[PDB]
Amino acid sequence: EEYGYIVTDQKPLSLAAGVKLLEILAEHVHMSSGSFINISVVGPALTFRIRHNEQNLSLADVTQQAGLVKSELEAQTGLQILQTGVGQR
Amino acid sequence: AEEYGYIVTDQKPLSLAAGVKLLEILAEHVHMSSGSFINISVVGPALTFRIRHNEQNLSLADVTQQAGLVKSELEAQTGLQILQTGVGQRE
Amino acid sequence: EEYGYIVTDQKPLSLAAGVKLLEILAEHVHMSSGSFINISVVGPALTFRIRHNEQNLSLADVTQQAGLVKSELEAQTGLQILQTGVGQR
Amino acid sequence: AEEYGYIVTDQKPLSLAAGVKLLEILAEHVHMSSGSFINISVVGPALTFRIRHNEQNLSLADVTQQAGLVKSELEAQTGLQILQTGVGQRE
Ligand SMILES: [Ca+2]
Ligand SMILES: [Ca+2]
Ligand SMILES: [Ca+2]
Ligand SMILES: [Ca+2]
Ligand SMILES: [Ca+2]
Ligand SMILES: [Ca+2]
C-alpha cells in the first residue's frame, strides 16, 4: 500500500494542478497519465499509485524522474516542488 | 541549497541515535562506510542527510531506493516505522 | 558556516560513536542531542552545528564543555579525544 | 601533558613570524602582554601555545573563544585564513 509523493509549496495543492504535474511527468517518462491511479491531493502533497506499464516504471522510478525534471514541472503548473518520494498515506 | 535524502518515521521526535542507526543499517546494505552519510540531522520525526563522494557512485536516489528495498529490515532492527523516504531540495 | 569539532584517535571515527559522544555531551549540558545538527564524521573528527536552544549554548560553549568532560566522553565511547574546537569544514 | 591552544591556518607551512603576529593581535585584544603566550611552536599549518599565569585569569578556552570573536581582524592583519581554533591535550 505504498504511494508516490510529490510535495509542493501549495496550501492547499489544487487537484487540477496535481494532475497537471502528472500529465507533464507522464509525457516525460513516455507513459499515459491514466496509468497514475489512486490519486489524492493532501495538504501540499500529491499522492498516487502506478498501474502496470510496458516500461516497468516503479514508484521509485517516476518520483526520481519527477525530481530530475522538477523545474519543467514547476514552470508549467505555478508551484514549487520541495520533495519527491515514496511512503504510506 | 543542494538535494538531501530523508526518512520520515513515526517517532515524535526521532532520536539522533535511532536516525544514525538507520544509516548504519543502510550503509552495511549498500556496502559503503556509514561515515559517507554526511550533514545529518534529526528534526521532528525525520532524518535528513547527504552523501559524500564515493567510488561506488551511490546517489541520494540510489540510497533512498535501497532504503525501500530493505524497509522491513530497517523497521525490525530499530523498532520504529518508516512512513516516507525520498529526496528533497529547498527552493 | 562554522562548525564545532571533536577530534579523536579514531581511524576512521565511526558515525555511531560520534553521535554517542554527542548524546553524552547533550546530557551533560542539558540539551536534546537532536539540537546537534549538520553532523558529519570526517577522518578522526566529529563535526556539527547547533540549533537554537533555551540555554543559549554556542559552538564555543559545547566544545569547551566537551573538553572539560572528555574523560567521561571517552570512558563510554571507546575512543580518545585529542582536540575540541571550532572551524570551517 | 598539559592542555595547549591552537590555531590551524591555510599556510603550508605557517611561518614563525606570522604565528607570533596572530598572538600579538590576540594579546592586544585581550589586554594581556603577548609575552604571556608561552611554549609557542608552529608545526605545519598550525600554531600551538600555552598561557602563563595572569591577573586577568585568562584561560585557553577564553583566548580561543576570543580568537573566534576577532577572526576577521586576525585574518585581515596577517593575510592568512584561520581554519580552526581550539584546545588540545595529548592522551
Ligand atoms: Ca524500473
Ligand atoms: Ca523549483
Ligand atoms: Ca511499516
Ligand atoms: Ca552561551
Ligand atoms: Ca583521554
Ligand atoms: Ca576566513
The biggest beta sheet of chain A is recorded as: 4 strands, antiparallel
N- to C-terminal distance of chain A: 8 Å
Helix content of chain A: 25-40%
At the fourth level of CATH, the homologous superfamily of chain A is: Protein-tyrosine phosphatase receptor IA-2 ectodomain
The oligomeric state of the chains shown is: homotetramer
- SSE string of chain A, helix = H, strand = E? EHEEHHE
Using a beta-carbon cutoff below 8 angstroms, give the protein chain pair with the largest interface and the number of residues from each chain.
B-C, 20 and 18 residues
- CATH topology type of chain A: Alpha-Beta Plaits
| Global structural class of chain A | alpha+beta
Report the total helices of chain A: 3
Structural domain tally of chain A: 1
Strand content of chain A: 25-35%
Trace the largest sheet of chain A across and list its strands.
Answer: 2-3-1-4
CATH architecture of chain A: 2-Layer Sandwich
Overall geometry of chain A: globular
Question: How do the strands and helices of this protein lay out in sequence?
Answer:
4 copies of one chain form a homotetramer.
Chain A: E1 3-8, H1 15-29, E2 36-42, E3 45-50, H2 59-68, H3 70-77, E4 81-87
Antiparallel strand pairs in A: 1-3, 1-4, 2-3
Helix pairs in contact in A: 1-3
Bound molecules: calcium ion (CA) (6 copies).
Subcellular location (chains A, C): Cytoplasmic vesicle, Secretory vesicle membrane
Protein name (chains A, C): ICA512-transmembrane fragment
Region (Sufficient for dimerization of proICA512) (chains A, C): 1-89
